[PDB]
Amino acid sequence: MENFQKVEKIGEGTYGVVYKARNKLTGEVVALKKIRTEGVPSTAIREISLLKELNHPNIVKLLDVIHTENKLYLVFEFLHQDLKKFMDASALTGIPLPLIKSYLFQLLQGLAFCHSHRVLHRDLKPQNLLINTEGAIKLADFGLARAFGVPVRTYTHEVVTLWYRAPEILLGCKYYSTAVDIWSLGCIFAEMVTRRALFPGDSEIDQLFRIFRTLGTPDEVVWPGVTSMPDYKPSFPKWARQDFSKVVPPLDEDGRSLLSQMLHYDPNKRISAKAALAHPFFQDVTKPVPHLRL
Numbered sequence: 149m150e151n152f153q154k155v156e157k158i159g160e161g162t163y164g165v166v167y168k169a170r171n172k173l174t175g176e177v178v179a180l181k182k183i184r185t186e187g188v189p190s191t192a193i194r195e196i197s198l199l200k201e202l203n204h205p206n207i208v209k210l211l212d213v214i215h216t217e218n219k220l221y222l223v224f225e226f227l228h229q230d231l232k233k234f235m236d237a238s239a240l241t242g243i244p245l246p247l248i249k250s251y252l253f254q255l256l257q258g259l260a261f262c263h264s265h266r267v268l269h270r271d272l273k274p275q276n277l278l279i280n281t282e283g284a285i286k287l288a289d290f291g292l293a294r295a296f297g298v299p300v301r302t303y304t305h306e307v308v309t310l311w312y313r314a315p316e317i318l319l320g321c322k323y324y325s326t327a328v329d330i331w332s333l334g335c336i337f338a339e340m341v342t343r344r345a346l347f348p349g350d351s352e353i354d355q356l357f358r359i360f361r362t363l364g365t366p367d368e369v370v371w372p373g374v375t376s377m378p379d380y381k382p383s384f385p386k387w388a389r390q391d392f393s394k395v396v397p398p399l400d401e402d403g404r405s406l407l408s409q410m411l412h413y414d415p416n417k418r419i420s421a422k423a424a425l426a427h428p429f430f431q432d433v434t435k436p437v438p439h440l441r442l
């Protein structure tokens with residue numbers, strides 16, 4: 149509208165273009181996401197509206213949802229940087245462990261909150277984690293995926309990142325559980341630690357096989373029901389699980405232990421956000437100040 153004064157284009161979000169904008173009235177600086185269509189699902193409107201009440205310090209606040217002219221505008225509290233940029237910027241030195249730990253702990257608090265409220269993220273990735281100068285990190289775009297089917301190609305037909313997708317999703321499971329978010333977060337945790345994506349698949353099958361090559365091809369022993377999953381094929385090659393100390397060196401045993409529980413194949417054995425918060429890895433957690441250059 150005209151209530152907002154566009155400051156600049158932030159990018160081509162998962163659904164549409166994103167602008168940093170200023171409310172000409174409140175002077176508030178926000179992120180404005182314009183979403184793509186034959187009137188936009190009124191069901192999505194109701195659902196999205198619900199997300200406005202989902203308030204937590206580690207969840208990017210959804211200030212407003214405006215449906216007009218077949219266009220859907222989402223107004224979010226604004227944060228200056230995402231974790232992908234931060235990780236790229238810290239690539240040479242690595243994010244100090246205390247900060248990695250603080251971020252993981254805050255992200256789990258955010259997930260525990262969303263999950264206790266029956267809200268799933270479904271598409272967690274570094275890009276969707278925003279940080280500020282105070283050392284806070286927040287989950288962005290939480291319950292959107294459920295209010296808009298499944299991803300494939302953004303407006304500019306950009307390639308959908310499969311790197312953080314849980315295996316049950318890749319094996320065609322129809323009902324996501326809170327476990328898919330823990331999986332993505334485990335992938336992100338590993339990436340902050342090693343400074344390299346854990347499973348950088350460039351196709352759905354390559355994603356699945358990269359997971360299999362590292363964690364071992366799942367079977368009925370470690371994942372009851374896996375062989376009956378929609379896209380499971382008996383012809384999948386059978387790779388032996390790799391030693392976990394080789395996956396995220398030089399992370400300590402507390403860290404490797406937590407990660408392994410976040411990466412259990414069986415969604416039901418995978419650790420919950422709540423339980424993960426109690427893991428010994430967080431015994432000495434603190435809240436460091438990141439070195440952000442805005």
Ligand SMILES: NC(=O)c1cc([N+](=O)[O-])c(Cl)cc1NCc1cccnc1
Binds near residue numbers: 226
């Ligand atoms: N809530 C937000 O602040 C925000 C929202 C969206 N988005 O609605 O999709 C996106 Cl892309 C980025 C954001 N900020 C990070 C940022 C800020 C300035 C420049 N580059 C990145």
